[PDB]
Amino acid sequence: SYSSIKLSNNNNNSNSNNIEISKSES
Amino acid sequence: SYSSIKLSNNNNNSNSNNIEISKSES
Amino acid sequence: SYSSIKLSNNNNNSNSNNIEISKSES
Amino acid sequence: SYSSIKLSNNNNNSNSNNIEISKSES
Amino acid sequence: SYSSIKLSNNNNNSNSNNIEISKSES
Amino acid sequence: SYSSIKLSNNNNNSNSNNIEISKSES
Amino acid sequence: SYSSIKLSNNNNNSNSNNIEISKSES
Amino acid sequence: SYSSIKLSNNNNNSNSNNIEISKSES
Amino acid sequence: SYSSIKLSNNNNNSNSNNIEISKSES
Amino acid sequence: SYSSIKLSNNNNNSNSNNIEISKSES
Amino acid sequence: SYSSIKLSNNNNNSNSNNIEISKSES
Amino acid sequence: SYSSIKLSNNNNNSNSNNIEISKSES
Prior knowledge:
homododecamer; mainly beta; 2 strands; GH09289p (chains A, B, C, D, E, F, G, H, I, J, K, L); protein fibril; dodecameric; Tropomyosin 1 I/C
């Protein structure tokens, strides 16, 4: 199970670049 | 199970680039 | 189960580039 | 499953490039 | 299941390039 | 199981770059 | 400037399901 | 400026399900 | 400025499910 | 600004599930 | 400024599940 | 500012599950 979150050089944003993930698997 | 999130050089955005994912699998 | 998200160099956007995904798979 | 999302070099957009996907599969 | 989304070099758009997909598959 | 969170050089952001992941696997 | 509305199969309602989205800017 | 509304199968409600979104900017 | 609303199968409610979102700025 | 609302299968409620969000700035 | 709301399968409640979020600045 | 709300499967409650968050800054 490989997970990688990398947020770089994100500036001056308003209400932006928000990530919401709801994943279900069987 | 590979997952990767990369946000780079996103600037001065308003109410933009928002990701909302709801995936269900069986 | 491969998943990837890459947001790069998206600037000065207003109410744009918003992704909303709701997938179901039986 | 394979899923890819890539947003690159989208600038100065108003109310544009929004994706809203609601898929079902039995 | 393969899904790909690629938004590149879309600039200065107003109320354009919006995608709204509601797909059902039994 | 590999996890990597890297937050770098994100400045002057308002209500932005937030990540919420609710992932379930079997 | 982008408005998508879908109302279907809402029956026998009383003072219900009223949506008001207002924005003022200056 | 981007508004997506989807009301379906809401029945026999009374003074319920009312949504108000207001934003004044200055 | 980005508003996504989805009401589905809400039935026989009384003074319920009422959402109000307000924001004033100066 | 960014507001995502999803109400699904809420039935027979009385004075319940009411959400208020208010923000005042100066 | 960023608000995400998801109410699903809340039934037969009385004066319950009421959420108030207030923020005053000066 | 940032508000995420997820209420699911809360049934037959009386005067319960009520959440208030208030902040006044001066």
